[PDB]
Ligand binder design. Structure first.
Ligand SMILES: [Zn+2]
Length: 951
């Protein structure tokens, strides 16, 4: 009554949504939404503060980002640093946060039982954080490492370069991430106490009038309402005026500019930008969504289609980009072919010709109506989100929409306002444009460097006579509006559940040609289906040349199918087609109504495909770069890759693929396809709103189309080989070493192979991984500050398993190696002394994690699909393994550690991948390792495991 100041009438929800909701506004100022899902397996909460990096003090970059790392490391009520992240891992929860221009968003999940405890430790973040002084000095490295990781990333360099080329006076130009220089080194010199400024900032800006909160749990709406006022009405209201940025960072002198930028990767893009007013207030019209939908269209007669036909671009992104309260952007972005790079002036002329077509036709109401009705259906039949992401998302939009309209806001449109559409289109003119070109061909032709990333670039005014030519853009007869979307689903009838329906997928077809798994959706009752198909052919991956052609084949298919499939995707019917090391994979997801039509179109195109010579030469060139560009990926992911290579029977390197790519010629590909298609086996999972006989009907048309157009015949049982994992010797230690030529950081992966997956070995590892998970992050990242990325947990490949550690660091790996090793003895000593109640707490956290129910169809499909592709077929895996997990004693875990994982275990199987940077508590003594010189020699030098036996 007293701490609450207003109560949500009905929160308009989707008719299918079975959770219940209540909006609140506390006397506080805080806007709240509560979600009662009596069935939820995990409770969650999020809090969004409408302040962010855009409000960082000019002389301390990344203060608010640094503040958000800091809130995690202890408060008054709970003073031990990791009490937060520890509580969560012992009760099956996880937590995370992000910082943007105007928001700082914090969120967690946890067992539906331990919501009150978890929410308490979370609420403290906003009442009285410690900002411990020693914790300040450590966690600044984490932020510094977070930046280090991005320095060599092209998307970030570009992100910050935009800001470095607008008004320097505007808060837009601020460096939002911060690093050790700005957060520590600069301020110590300038005589600034950072902890003070952290505290000064928290109190000045972390005010309740600027906070939204979302809590979801099993507890009822009354219980929850009490729980939040208990914990949050005690937050002070300093009545902080919400920052507004009415002036655009792009003024008169910032338009008609051209930017020539050197990338890190070999990529060619064109970025076209128009400054615009904050469209946020017109949300129910979305004039920007309407113009983006058209400019961004990929169907017949679209801007993309003509630009692709000219052979200039491959992909196009168009529409409205957020800025802040008071300013926004409209963008049209394209990648460029070699030809395209030479023809930028023309590409842009085409852009303006398409905009001209829109001017000369004026707003199309049927288009708006089509988008409204699609949204209507989308919203009606939306999948039940996971709590963590849902609370977070909502907590964010509570700042933009009255409490009743939050669930519908970012979905439903209402008034077609043709006048605003005209108002926005009017801003998309040549005199209003900033143009940026990214290409390796500007290497050493640039004369500017951007401070924070070191991005090489050049700034030119666009010649007036060029602006003038674009202003006179006439009508190009190749640009038509889209036609009515004929993929819109109309039939949403959920078919009655069948008499012979199974809880798990039943094997309903078992020929030499087809293995079909089927389950009629029994949990969700949405008019959708997931249709998955693995096709096996030995010719898919027989050698690098063939691997290359497999890839290109499917890439060219999707390219030619794209015009057709775009409309389908917009209507919530999508597909996924890609080559695998055993063949191809295809999945059709979405509304079941028109699924047959698209699927058959795909198999038809697949089996009768006619290559276009120009498309072939263009995609090939892009794949060439794509392969080369791996050198500019991150050390930690180089490490992961190298080891994937070392540990798999057959694996082709990127160099091997790159070299063999020069030999893929047009005819050699035409020949390849019928060869690939002639002998197949198809394993499938069809899962959703379909009957067991519509399923058989699906398989039959898939087969029938293949037999009929590609003369496909069955494979032999003996041809269906899976790959084995390299089998490491007891007491052996191997190191493969390589350098990353792009990042000045190192990566590492450490792998302790245990044994073949079996209920027992599976759960020994999974329990240990659980017990060590949290301490691992806290010791190596939080205490020792080795790097922003520190990972651990299970590794599962080709039926085998083991423990892994991934670290990316400033330190060299030979060192990171001893520190992980140092951590391991510590976890032993810490399990010896570990209390019997702490043990069951963990066993329980694994339990809830594994027995976590799927929220949507796809999560369920993925669980079964994992079981099918891995050829283990254990669909009731969770139950038996969790049931077996519970019987596990504390000394089982110790026996298992002692025998497999310990430094002097009789059966220790260690491989390490050390990726060196661009320029290169007591730890135990380690053996001299055997240094892998050759990946092939190494693989040949030892045995290969069996393959798993199919349950
Ligand atoms: Zn961060």
């Amino acid at each position: 009554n007293p701490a609450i100041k207003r109560i949500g009438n009905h929160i308009t929800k989707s008719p299918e949504d079975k959770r219940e909701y209540r909006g609140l506004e506390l006397a506080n100022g805080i806007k709240v939404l509560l979600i009662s899902d009596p069935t939820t397996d995990k409770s969650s909460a999020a809090l969004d503060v409408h302040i962010g990096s855009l409000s960082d003090p000019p002389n301390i970059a990344g203060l608010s980002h640094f503040l958000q790392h800091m809130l995690f490391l202890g408060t008054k009520k709970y003073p031990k640093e990791n009490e937060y992240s520890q509580f969560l891992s012992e009760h099956a929860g996880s937590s995370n946060a992000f910082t943007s221009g105007e928001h700082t968003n914090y969120y967690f999940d946890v067992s539906h039982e331990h919501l009150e405890g978890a929410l308490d430790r979370f609420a403290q973040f906003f009442l009285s954080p410690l900002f411990d002084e020693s914790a300040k000095d450590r966690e600044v490295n984490a932020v510094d490492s977070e930046h280090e990781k991005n320095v060599m990333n092209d998307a970030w360099r570009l992100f910050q370069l935009e800001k470095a080329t607008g008004n320097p006076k505007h808060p837009f130009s601020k460096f939002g991430t911060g690093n050790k220089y700005t957060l520590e080194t600069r301020p110590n010199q300038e005589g600034i106490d950072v902890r003070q400024e952290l505290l000064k900032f928290h109190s000045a800006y972390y005010s309740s009038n600027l906070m939204a909160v979302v809590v979801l749990g099993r507890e009822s709406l009354d219980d929850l309402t009490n729980l939040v006022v208990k914990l949050f009405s005690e937050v002070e209201n300093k009545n902080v005026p919400l920052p507004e940025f009415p002036e655009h960072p792009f003024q008169e002198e910032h338009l008609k500019q051209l930017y020539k930028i050197v990338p890190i990767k070999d990529i060619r893009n064109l970025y076209v930008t128009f400054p615009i007013p904050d469209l946020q207030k017109y949300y129910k019209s979305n004039p920007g969504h309407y113009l983006g939908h058209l400019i961004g269209h990929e169907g017949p007669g679209s801007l993309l289609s003509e630009l692709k036909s000219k052979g200039w671009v491959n992909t196009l992104v168009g529409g409205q980009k957020e800025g802040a309260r008071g300013f926004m952007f409209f963008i049209i972005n394209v990648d460029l072919t070699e030809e395209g790079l030479l023809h930028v002036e023309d590409i842009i002329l085409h852009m303006f010709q398409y905009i001209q077509k829109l001017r000369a036709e004026g707003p199309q109401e049927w288009v708006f109506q089509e988008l409204k009705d699609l949204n209507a259906v989308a919203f009606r039949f939306k999948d039940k989100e996971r709590p963590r992401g849902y609370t977070s998302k909502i907590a964010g939009i509570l700042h933009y929409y009255p409490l009743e309209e939050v669930l519908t806001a970012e979905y439903l449109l209402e008034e077609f306002r043709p006048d605003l559409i005209e108002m926005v289109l009017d801003k998309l003119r040549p005199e209003n444009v900033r143009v940026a070109i990214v290409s390796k061909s500007f290497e050493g032709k640039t004369d500017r460097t951007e401070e924070w990333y070191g991005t090489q670039y050049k700034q030119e005014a666009i010649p007036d006579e060029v602006i003038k030519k674009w202003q006179n853009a006439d009508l190009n007869g190749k640009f038509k509006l889209p036609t009515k979307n004929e993929f819109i689903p109309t039939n949403f009838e959920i078919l009655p559940l069948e008499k012979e329906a199974t809880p798990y997928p039943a094997l309903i077809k078992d020929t030499a040609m087809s293995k079909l798994w089927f389950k009629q959706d029994d949990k969700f009752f949405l008019p959708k289906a997931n249709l998955n198909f693995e096709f096996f052919s030995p010719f898919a991956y027989v050698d690098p040349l063939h691997s290359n052609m497999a890839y290109l084949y499917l890439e060219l298919l999707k390219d030619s199918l794209n015009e057709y499939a775009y409309a389908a995707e917009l209507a919530g019917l999508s597909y996924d087609l890609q080559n695998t090391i055993y063949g191809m994979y295809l999945s059709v997801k979405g509304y079941n109504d028109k699924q047959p039509i698209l699927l058959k179109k795909i198999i038809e195109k697949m089996a009768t495909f006619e290559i276009d010579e120009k498309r072939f030469e263009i995609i090939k060139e892009a794949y060439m770069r794509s392969l080369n560009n791996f050198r500019a990926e991150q050390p930690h992911q180089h490490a992961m890759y190298y080891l994937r290579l070392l540990m798999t029977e057959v694996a082709w390197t990127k160099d091997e693929l790159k070299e063999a790519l020069d030999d893929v010629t047009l005819p050699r590909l035409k020949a390849f396809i019928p060869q690939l298609l002639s002998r197949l086996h198809i394993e499938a999972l069809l899962h959703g709103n379909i009957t067991k006989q519509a399923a058989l009907g699906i398989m039959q048309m898939v087969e029938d189309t293949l037999i009929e157009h590609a003369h496909t015949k069955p494979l032999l049982p003996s041809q269906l080989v899976r790959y084995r994992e390299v089998q490491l010797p007891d007491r052996g230690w191997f190191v493969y070493q390589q350098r990353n030529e792009v990042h000045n950081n190192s990566g590492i992966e450490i792998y302790y192979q245990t044994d073949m997956q079996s209920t027992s070995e599976n759960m020994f590892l999974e329990l240990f991984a659980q017990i060590i998970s949290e301490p691992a992050f806290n010791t190596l990242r939080t205490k020792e500050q080795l790097g922003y990325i520190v990972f651990s947990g299970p590794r599962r490949a080709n039926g085998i398993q083991g423990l892994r550690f991934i670290i990316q660091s400033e330190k060299p790996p030979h060192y990171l190696e001893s520190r992980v090793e140092a951590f391991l003895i510590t976890m032993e000593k810490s399990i010896e002394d570990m209390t019997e109640e702490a043990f069951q707490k963990h066993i329980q956290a694994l339990a809830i994690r594994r027995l976590d129910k799927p929220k949507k169809l796809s999560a369920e499909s993925a669980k079964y699909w994992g079981e099918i592709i891995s050829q283990q077929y254990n669909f009731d895996r969770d139950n038996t393994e969790v049931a077996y997990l519970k019987t596990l004693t504390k000394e089982d875990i110790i026996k298992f550690y002692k025998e497999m994982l310990a430094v002097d275990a009789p059966r220790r199987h260690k491989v390490s991948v050390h990726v060196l940077a661009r320029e290169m508590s007591q730890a135990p003594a380690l053996p001299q390792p055997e240094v892998i010189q050759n990946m092939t020699e190494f693989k040949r030098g030892l045995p290969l495991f069996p393959l798993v036996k199919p349950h």
